[PDB]
């Protein structure tokens, strides 16, 4: 019985919460606060440990870009710093392959990164790998068949709909079919054998639509849209279902958590976070 962890986020300022939802009985846990409040970070899990990567601390008296990596042990209910990234990375995307963490893109003030770096836990170290084809902030990331997909984002001029695929054995990137819809701050995950991208902001409106990529057809197909339009949401899969947490919808900060059932192509509301927020790092363990 694994949990959905939610870390950081933003409400009136960047938050430092760590909370976890247990989908089999609907309860929320109030776990240890992060060391430093952060939103636009990403979360992932490696060998039962949760990690929070990048982001920004947008406080009321000015904002700092985070290059930090922190690790939480559900056993000790404790965070611990890990080596920092080579560079501050706000609105970063993250995927895991072979127990190695890929820190993809993000921002540093005006700098929109195309650089990617890899973290090896067994030796607390970050190593620059090959940069992506496009600079990307607010990028969704998804790992499939031992490859990493970078989806959507913003290049420092345009909000993107393009997507790339990284090949770790070859250390190189390749563009793939663009998405139907342009998407900044979408949630990107992997359910069954497809990459999903839900919500985001298209340059005009915050979206509720959900499209999925098929690796063999190379085509994107919309599926049932969500009930609530949202951007800078958190996403993850827990037992064959997609879970989306909060986000911003052009008006307020959502506390709403929707669940996607792929068999029946429907969405439903399964719970509310204890408080509405956007830009959270989400993972399962």
């Amino acid at each position: 019985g694994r949990l959905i962890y939610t870390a950081g986020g933003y409400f009136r300022q960047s938050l430092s919460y760590l909370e976890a939802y247990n989908p089999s009985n609907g309860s929320w846990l109030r776990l240890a606060d992060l060391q430093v409040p952060r939103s636009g970070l990403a979360g992932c899990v490696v060998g039962g440990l949760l990690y929070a990567v990048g982001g920004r601390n947008n406080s009321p008296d000015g904002n700092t870009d985070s290059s930090a990596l922190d690790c939480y042990n559900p056993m000790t209910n404790q965070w611990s710093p890990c080596a920092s990234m080579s560079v501050p990375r706000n609105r970063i995307g993250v995927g895991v392959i072979d127990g190695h963490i890929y820190a993809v893109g993000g921002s540093h003030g005006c700098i929109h990164h195309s650089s990617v770096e890899r973290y090896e836990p067994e030796r607390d170290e970050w190593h620059l790998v090959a940069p992506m084809l496009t600079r990307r902030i607010g990028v969704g990331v998804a790992v499939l068949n031992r490859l990493l997909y970078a989806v959507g984002g913003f290049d420092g001029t345009n909000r993107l709909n393009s997507a790339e695929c990284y090949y770790p054995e070859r250390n190189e990137w390749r563009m793939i079919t663009p998405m139907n819809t342009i998407r900044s701050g979408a949630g990107v995950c992997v359910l069954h054998n497809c990459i999903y991208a839900a919500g985001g902001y298209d340059g005009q409106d915050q979206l509720n639509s959900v499209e999925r990529y098929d690796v063999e057809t190379e085509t994107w197909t919309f599926v049932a849209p969500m009930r609530h339009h949202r951007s800078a949401l958190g996403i993850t899969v827990h037992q064959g279902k997609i879970y989306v947490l909060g986000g911003y919808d052009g008006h307020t900060f959502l506390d709403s958590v929707e669940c996607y059932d792929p068999d029946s192509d429907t969405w439903s509301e399964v719970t509310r976070m204890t408080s509405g927020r956007s830009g959270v790092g989400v993972a399962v363990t």
């Binding site: 904002n63 913003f154 902001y201």
Partner: peptide, 11 residues
Amino acid sequence: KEVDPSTGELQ
């Protein structure tokens, strides 16, 4: 206030 439309954040 001014808010980044894709995240809701300020400035």
